[PDB]
Amino acid sequence: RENQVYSPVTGARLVAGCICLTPDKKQVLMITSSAHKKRWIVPKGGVEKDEPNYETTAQRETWEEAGCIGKIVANLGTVEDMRPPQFENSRKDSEVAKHPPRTEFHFYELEIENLLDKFPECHKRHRKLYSYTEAKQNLIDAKRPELLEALNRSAIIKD
Ligand SMILES: O=P(O)(O)O[C@H]1[C@H](OP(=O)(O)O)[C@@H](OP(=O)(O)O)[C@H](OP(=O)(O)O)[C@@H](OP(=O)(O)O)[C@H]1OP(=O)(O)O
């Protein structure tokens, strides 16, 4: 639908999600991408026109995509999907040609309180806890460095 919300400045799609950590902070909850079933990402989704804040979207998507309930304990701020829709060298560095972001992500750290077996997307995805090291590799394999930046801002133990 066109319940979707876009940055009035950049036209980027506004998305909220959760870095869901175990109480002991050693593991993060990851879900499989719907499109590519072997990519592990974190729960996230489009803000809808009715939603009063990013926390509402984040907790709605964490339940819908991962069957996860918990408490928001930190605002992890924003990251951008800077994937292009070719290059510009500058003497001692190279860059992709200027473009607006595809997506602006608002991420929150959640402490997991419960995982349920039945949730709206429970037949369309897997959901599993990973150590920092495994999660980092997962998000590089998924080609989602912005999701890794959000994970790095979380209190997850990096030992
Ligand atoms: O609503 P759409 O425009 O189709 O957005 C999709 C959708 O993102 P949302 O969950 O934010 O709606 C996919 O996510 P899921 O199907 O996994 O829930 C996501 O795929 P990822 O799983 O890899 O995030 C994909 O992004 P991609 O470009 O990687 O296909 C992204 O499309 P956009 O490129 O338009 O954001």
Residue numbers in the entry: 20 to 104, 113 to 186
Paper text:
The yeast diadenosine and diphosphoinositol polyphosphate phosphohydrolase DDP1 is a Nudix enzyme with pyrophosphatase activity on diphosphoinositides, dinucleotides, and polyphosphates. ScDDP1, like its human orthologs, adopts the canonical Nudix fold showing two β sheets flanked by helices. The active site lies in the crevice situated between both β sheets. The longest helix (α-1) contains the Nudix box (GX5EX7REUXEEXGU), which displays a β-loop-helix-loop structure that binds the Mg2+ ions involved in diphosphate moiety orientation and catalysis.
We have defined InsP6 binding as “binding mode 1” (bm1 mode), since its six phosphates make links to the enzyme satisfying all recognition positions, except Pβ of the diphosphate moiety, which is missing in this inositide. In this binding mode, the unique axial phosphate at the 2– position is directed toward the active site. All phosphates participate in one to four interactions with protein residues; thus, P1 makes two (Arg32), P2 makes three (Arg32 bidentate and Gly65 main chain), P3 makes four (Arg152 bidentate and Ser53 side and main chain), P4 makes three (Ser52, Lys63, Arg171), P5 makes three (Arg102 bidentate and Arg129), and P6 makes one (Arg129). Several water-mediated interactions stabilize the inositide. The mentioned residues are involved in the binding of all inositides studied in this work. Focusing on inositide binding, we found seven positions for phosphate recognition: Six positions are defined by the InsP6 complex plus a seventh defined by the “Pβ-to-be-cleaved” position in the PCP-InsP7 complex.
